[PDB]
Design a binder for this molecule. Structure first.
Ligand code: NA
Ligand code: NA
Lengths: 99, 99
């Protein structure tokens, strides 16, 4: 489900796209260059920023990683094996989420 | 630039995602399965539907193909070489277009 940009009601998948849209955020999250893949260069900073957006006290990587795993069975995202803090958007699921 | 779903003001890239979001449209446009790639199984029907949405008289594949080529230099889409009516979304450009 699509939210207004920069909104507190935003879902995690859209928030990550928002961070990736601005190259200035590369010290915490960056595109890998192929097929919707990205890397959290600073996963604790990504979790901190997610906590700030959702005003969720005690947001941390443990909780963020649980939230990302929820997307595996929803065709929104998968974990990329053999890399550090690497994930891949599923744009087949996100195309529906736009509707 | 993101438009309201199903709107007449929609841009071509978003309209194609709208058609791809519904498997019922596979007789004219379908996902290939990898990396944002899709195939127009009926390019004349895709052009007809685009013409109907934009109420553009004499919309045809020639004009649609010109419109798609415009996206090559904008990091929105490329043509997929060695396939029939195959294109690939660039989700790096589309992530910005969401903002
Ligand atoms: Na946003
Ligand atoms: Na739409």
């Amino acid at each position: 489900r699509l939210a207004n940009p920069g909104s507190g009601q935003i879902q995690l998948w859209q928030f990550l796209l928002e961070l990736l849209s601005d190259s200035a955020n590369a010290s915490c999250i960056t595109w890998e260059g192929t097929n919707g893949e990205f890397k959290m260069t600073d996963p604790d900073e990504v979790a901190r920023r997610w906590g700030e957006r959702k005003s969720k006290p005690n947001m941390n990587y443990d909780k963020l990683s649980r939230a990302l795993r929820y997307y595996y069975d929803k065709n929104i995202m998968t974990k990329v094996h053999g890399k550090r803090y690497a994930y891949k958007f599923d744009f087949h699921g996100i195309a529906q989420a736009l509707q």
